[PDB]
Amino acid sequence: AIPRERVIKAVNELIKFTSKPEEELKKDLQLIVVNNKSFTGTSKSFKLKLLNVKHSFYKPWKEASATAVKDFKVLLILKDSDIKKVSEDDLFDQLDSEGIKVDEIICGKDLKTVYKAYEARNAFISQFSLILADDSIVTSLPKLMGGKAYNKVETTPISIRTHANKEFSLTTLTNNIKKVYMNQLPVKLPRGTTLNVHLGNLEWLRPEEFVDNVELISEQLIKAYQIRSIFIKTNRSPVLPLYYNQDVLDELEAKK
Amino acid sequence: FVRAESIVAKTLATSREKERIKRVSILEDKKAKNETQHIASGKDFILKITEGLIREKTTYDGKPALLFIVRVRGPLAVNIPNKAFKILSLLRLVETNTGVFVKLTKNVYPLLKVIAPYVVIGKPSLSSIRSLIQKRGRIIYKGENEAEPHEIVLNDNNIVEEQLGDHGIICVEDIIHEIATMGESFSVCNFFLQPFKLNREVSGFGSLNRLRKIKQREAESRTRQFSNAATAPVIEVDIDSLLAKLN
Amino acid sequence: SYILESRKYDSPVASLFSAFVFYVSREVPIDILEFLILSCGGNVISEAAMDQIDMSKVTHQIVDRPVLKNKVAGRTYIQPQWIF
Amino acid sequence: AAETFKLFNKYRPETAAEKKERLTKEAAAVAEGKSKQDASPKPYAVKYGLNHVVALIENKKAKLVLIANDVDPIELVVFLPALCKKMGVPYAIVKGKARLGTLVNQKTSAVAALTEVRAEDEAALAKLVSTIDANFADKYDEVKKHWGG
Amino acid sequence: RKLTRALGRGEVSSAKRLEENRDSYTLDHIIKERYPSFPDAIRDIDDALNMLFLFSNLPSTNQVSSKIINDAQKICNQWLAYVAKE
Amino acid sequence: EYSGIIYVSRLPHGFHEKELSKYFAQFGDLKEVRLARNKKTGNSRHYGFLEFVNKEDAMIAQESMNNYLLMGHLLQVRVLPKGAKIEKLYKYKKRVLVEKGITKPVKQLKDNMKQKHEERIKKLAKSGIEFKW
RNA sequence: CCUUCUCAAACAUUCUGUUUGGUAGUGAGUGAUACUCUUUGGAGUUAACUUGAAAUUGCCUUAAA
């Protein structure tokens, strides 16, 4: 495992690096990067892998955005049939129990009709933080909503396995959204070797809990992609090796 | 003058078509070469859409049978792409509202999937094919006189003797057996028939029939579903009822 | 089809061949022989009829092809041109 | 014009059939369930009457204005282009009043006005008025100009 | 005329409404005058049946309105079924 | 006075030199057309140029279609001064990618990794952000 | 003057848990953080930020007439 005290001194040292010498809100947020052997080439993907975590930072994010201005919040898009079936009253029964709330539900006709006018499309979505979609529709979206959504890692859409096959029920979601809120995090596959993660903020939950979450993702991912090395920064800082893996470096010419 | 709006819609719909069909082309190549890790659904699918309408789902699970298939026009911006144009021109569906029979199998189940939006699909009935082949059917004859490249009506089972006696075939209800029962390899018939050139359902352009044309187009919008999705079900309809109109 | 429902005969041509059952080929023209057998009481069964769904059934059989094959040893057979 | 009518025919009005159908529905719903005239939605369609339209102007609320050329007591409408000029409002003259009779269900109307439109067509309208502004502000700004010489 | 007005305008809903809102003609008095009624009618059936059975084997095409053809087919086989069962 | 060169912009998608050619052949047998794509993953940056033959042909085309509307872009077209010389925009495709590597050996690049690991640690140390190892 | 890939499986039933796969974008720029390659040629991957879809230059036939 990585030294947790190396993590702890890293966070305190960048705290002092950020304390004294819009902009500060860009700077202060933490990024963690992984290099790996190679991602899938000649196949351009937009899917997201939902890596399990023990503690969500979205409740800190929501408590922060109650005060802040970017208005951390969610959007939903669905098939055409279910709008008459579902409403906000059910989730207002269920999700305030845990103390979260869905803003809106949308249909694809709404999406193509009123959030056309690409300026207005972007402007509608940009206030939203977390974008969520149907397991069916997820492949169809980018012809509709476009890659300005997909460039920003927050605004990149995510499916949900909605249809309890058959005769879909809402309860299948009112547990699943709780799962993905509290207990999972979506992460992207680019081309190449390099992969960024907008992991979180330091004003949110402690480095002690972030350390074990980082341990969880790293133990999950050392097997996942045969990964090369891991570094961290906060939005300018040159890379700090905290995991330096060279046993995987021996295989690169073995592949060829 | 050519109305650039019409031009760009033409090009765009052909762009959509060229896109989805190159998708399904190298998809079906990947199915055939059987590297089948990255596919949504490894299997085929079927929608028997019938009667504000009812929709029923299955797979082929072939088990092949016969089908009867007709060119309908559409949709409405699509200049001919080559990679469908050749295969449909083999299949002799040009000069639209022409109807032909087929026997399904796995080599050809993709061919219907590409030609799908250009065509209507369904399986026929015994009465339907009986009425069809008894009321219609057109054949060239060549021999011993009279070169005469004329499409000539079916009157003669002596023509069936002299042209299909190699197959042991007279008595055209034997052809009905070949079709209906998927008889002995059936390509004699499928090369022979000069298949049916059907009637325009509502000619018109009087006012009363303009209405009917619009009703027809609306029913087609209701009953046709061009999902274009490359895993989509194949569509099937009540051609028994529909040829009651069209025959 | 078009079954009739309610609510001396043609003497003799009505009810000729009464209590007859003809297993009729598909090759023969049905659309006229069926009018006559409906005129003079008799049942017909065509072989294409059952495609979708001990001394019982074979009373008579209708085939008027000149040549027929493969004929089997169990043929208690007439030809129908006499009936025609 | 063709684009204009592709737009407008979406926001065509309610006919009698649909009105009585709507009325029967909201008669069904007013009694037991609800009505604050919310049983039905806000309708959105053309405003077409002359007096009403020109009343809406100087409030002022019309997003677009369409003016027939061929009205026989032309003094009815001679003031209008000046009016929408002076109030800075999106007017344009059209060719044939019977067209407007098509789109608001009359023999003819001589004026069509838009004040309200659902959201999907806002930028479509925006480009539309930009087009006619690009037809009037530069080349039919000269409608008073071009004295011969 | 009203329908063409509705089509050069629109309000195709009312066009369909207008189509439903007509009363096609009947010929019962025509029959009851031209053949009074029964024995003369059955005297003169023959030329009807010839044209009827001709057209029911005649195929569908333009200039037909094949509604007519399937109507002829059913009325023909009604005749056949009656006279067969009798 | 102006030239037969014309500059059009504010184009939609699906509108390519195929379309321009078969359209503006209505107005004249063209001297030349050029279109603006991106060079990388080549798709339209929504403008182009043309000369049909003549100054008058360019003038009437511009006069006709200055404020012309379509699907919901509208083109703006303008007439240019004497010359003004369309000079560039070879028509760029979406290119096939080719892989020139990895020639250098695993052992040498691993030593590169070893030394630049330490290089990284010292540059963040001198930033200054101290780090052991 | 078209109108968008609207879902599939595996299991055991969960009145649904796990896994699998499934997208190739409007373009324009804004500034600027990191990793590969090979030789500078930067080819590919990396914080977010504007824009009314904006903008001037990177060897088939009846859907006729």
What DSSP string runs through A142-153?
GGTS-HHHHHSS
8 A C-beta contact, residue C26 and residue B176: yes
Alpha helix positions (H), D1-149: 2-8, 16-31, 50-56, 80-86, 98-103, 122-136
- Of B164, B127, B159, residue with least CA distance to B238: B127
Q: Which of residues 116-135 of D touch strand G (CB under 7 A)?
A: 123, 126-127, 130
- Of A187, A255, A235, A231, residue with least CA distance to A34: A231
Give chain A's length: 256
Residues of F in contact with A7 (CB under 8 A): none
| DSSP class of D47 | B
- Decide the pairing of beta strands F32-37 and F44-51: antiparallel
Q: Residue D3 pairs with which residues in a beta bridge?
A: none
Q: Name the token pair of A70.
A: 């970017």
Nearby residues of A224 by Cβ (< 8 Å), 6 or more positions away:
none
Amino acid at B83: K
Protein residue nearest nucleotide G39, by CA to C1': F100
- Decide the pairing of beta strands A194-200 and A30-35: antiparallel
The Cα–Cα gap between A49 and F128 comes to 36
Packed helices A88-98 and A176-183: angle between N→C axes, nearest 10 degrees: 40
Alpha helix positions (H), A32-87: 58-65
Q: Residue B103 pairs with which residues in a beta bridge?
A: B66
Q: Among B134, B174, B181, whose Cβ lies nearest the Cβ of C51?
A: B181
Q: Give the count of alpha carbons within 13 A of B84, CB side only.
A: 24
Q: Name the token pair of B209.
A: 């029939």
Determine phi and psi for F72, rounding to 5 degrees: -75, 30
C43 — contact with chain E (CB < 8 Å)? no
Task: Provide the number of structural domains found in chain B.
Answer: 1
Instruction: List C-alpha distances in Å: A115 to A112, A149, D3.
Output: 6, 12, 21
Instruction: List C-alpha distances in Å: B75 to A53, B13, F13, F110.
Output: 49, 9, 20, 59
Nearest nucleotide over every DNA/RNA strand to the F44 CA, judged by C1': G27
Q: Starting at the earlier edge strand, list the strands of the sheet with C43-46.
A: C43-46, C21-24, C60-62
| DSSP class of F69 | B
8 A C-beta contact, residue F15 and residue F81: no
The alpha carbon of residue A102 and the mean position of all alpha carbons in its chain are separated, in whole angstroms, by 17
The Cα–Cα gap between D48 and D103 comes to 10
- Rounded to 5°, the CA angle F56-D92-D149 comes to 50
B46: CB within 7 A of chain G nucleic strand? no
Which residue range is the domain that position D45 belongs to? Answer: 1-149
- Decide the pairing of beta strands D64-68 and D91-94: parallel
F106: CB within 7 A of chain G nucleic strand? no
| DSSP class of C76 | -
Cis status of the peptide bond prior to F129, with omega within 30 of 0: no
Torsion of CA E35, E41, E43, E47, to 10 degrees: 100
The Cα–Cα gap between D53 and D115 comes to 9
8 A C-beta contact, residue A250 and residue F107: no
Q: Which of residues 32-71 of F touch strand G (CB under 7 A)?
A: 34, 36-41, 43-47, 49, 69-71
8 A C-beta contact, residue C40 and residue C14: yes
Q: Name the token pair of D110.
A: 């001589």
8 A C-beta contact, residue F18 and residue B11: yes
The Cα–Cα gap between E67 and B209 comes to 14
Amino acid at D114: L
DSSP codes joined into one string, B218-238: HHHHHH------SSPPEEE--
Tokens 């003169």, residue located: E44
Nucleotide G44 C1' to residue E4 CA (A):
64
Q: Give the count of alpha carbons within 13 A of F92, CB side only.
A: 14
8 A C-beta contact, residue D115 and residue D106: no
The Cα–Cα gap between B188 and B178 comes to 10
Determine phi and psi for A230, rounding to 5 degrees: -135, 140
Nucleotide G22 C1' to residue B125 CA (A):
37
Q: Residue F2 pairs with which residues in a beta bridge?
A: F81
Q: Residue F27 pairs with which residues in a beta bridge?
A: none
A140: CB within 7 A of chain G nucleic strand? yes
Amino acid at B73: R
Tokens 């090009």, residue located: B11
The Cα–Cα gap between A4 and A10 comes to 9
Instruction: List C-alpha distances in Å: A240 to A7, A8, A93, A237, D111.
Output: 11, 13, 46, 8, 71
8 A C-beta contact, residue D28 and residue D62: no
8 A C-beta contact, residue B123 and residue B111: no
The Cα–Cα gap between B224 and B237 comes to 10
Query: Helix (H) and strand (E) counts for chain F?
Result: 3, 4
Amino acid at D122: E
The Cα–Cα gap between D115 and D90 comes to 11
8 A C-beta contact, residue D93 and residue D67: yes
Nucleotide G57 C1' to residue F24 CA (A):
21
Q: Starting at the earlier edge strand, list the strands of the sheet with A240-244.
A: A194-200, A30-35, A229-233, A240-244
Q: Which of residues 93-122 of D touch E (CB under 8 A)?
A: 101-103, 105
8 A C-beta contact, residue B122 and residue B246: no
Q: Residue F50 pairs with which residues in a beta bridge?
A: F6, F33
D3 — contact with chain F (CB < 8 Å)? yes
Amino acid at A87: S
Distance (Å) from the C-alpha of residue C27 to the closest C-alpha of chain B? 5
PDB experimental method: cryo-EM
Instruction: List C-alpha distances in Å: B144 to A196, B151, B153, B192, F3.
Output: 81, 17, 19, 19, 72
Nearby residues of B195 by Cβ (< 8 Å), 6 or more positions away:
B92, B98, B99, B100, B101
Q: Residue F37 pairs with which residues in a beta bridge?
A: F44
Task: Provide the number of structural domains found in chain D.
Answer: 1
| DSSP class of B117 | G
Which residue range is the domain that position B189 belongs to? Answer: 1-247
8 A C-beta contact, residue C40 and residue C17: yes
Tell me which nucleotides of strand G come within 7 A of a protein CB: 1-9, 15-29, 32-39, 41, 43-65
**Strand blocks (E) in chain C:** 21-24, 43-46, 60-62
Q: Name the token pair of E55.
A: 């057209």
- Of C37, C44, C49, C46, residue with least CA distance to C13: C37
Q: Which of residues 204-243 of A touch strand G (CB under 7 A)?
A: 231, 233, 235-239
Chains with 3+ CB–CB pairs under 8 A to D are A, E, F
Determine phi and psi for C35, rounding to 5 degrees: -60, -40
Q: Name the token pair of F69.
A: 């509307």
Residues of B in contact with F71 (CB under 8 A): 5, 8-9
The Cα–Cα gap between E62 and B110 comes to 35
- Helix, strand and coil percent figures for chain B, each rounded to 5: 45, 15, 40
Tokens 């003094």, residue located: D75
